[PDB]
Amino acid sequence: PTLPYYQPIPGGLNVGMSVYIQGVASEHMKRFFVNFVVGQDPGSDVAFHFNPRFDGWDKVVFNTLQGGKWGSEERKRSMPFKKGAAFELVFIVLAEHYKVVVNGNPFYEYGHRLPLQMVTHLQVDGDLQLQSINFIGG
Ligand SMILES: O=S(=O)(O)O[C@H]1[C@@H](O)[C@@H](CO)O[C@@H](O[C@H]2[C@H](O)[C@@H](O)[C@H](O)O[C@@H]2CO)[C@@H]1O
């Protein structure tokens, strides 16, 4: 797959589904994001924005974009990616939250703010190369 990636999630999200992304963080990475998006029209809401950042104290930001407004960020001040390194990034969709697992290590649980059933698309962009994106347990 090529970037930017913005593709429908076959069948939409359901509890029990996993999204499995294999990629390589750029040697020159500043940020990348994975968005679970409600639609494909301009101005679409983002149910879940997952955003690793190397600018400053390395961290991952988690948020929702609704009605053109970013919500209150959740943040984890740990960086599970490494510049130039391949990663395995998994989102397990559960009733209460998205469970994020990186390279086998549980990383975060982001509580649903928009109903998960409204998500139609996965969008990925930023400073990485993608090897694959797979939807499991749909
Ligand atoms: O690429 S973007 O989606 O435009 O980047 C935005 C997102 O990463 C959101 C996620 O919350 O953050 C925005 O920046 C925030 C910044 O993290 C925060 O420290 C500051 O207080 O507010 C900014 C604007 O909401 C990104 O612009």
Swiss-Prot record:
Domain Galectin, which positions?
5-136
Q: Main role?
A: Galectin that binds lactose and a related range of sugars. May be involved in the assembly of adherens junctions.
Subunit info here reads:
Monomer.
- Please provide the record's free-text comment about the domains of this protein: Contains two homologous but distinct carbohydrate-binding domains.
State what protein this is by name: Galectin-4
| Organism for this UniProt entry | Homo sapiens (Human)
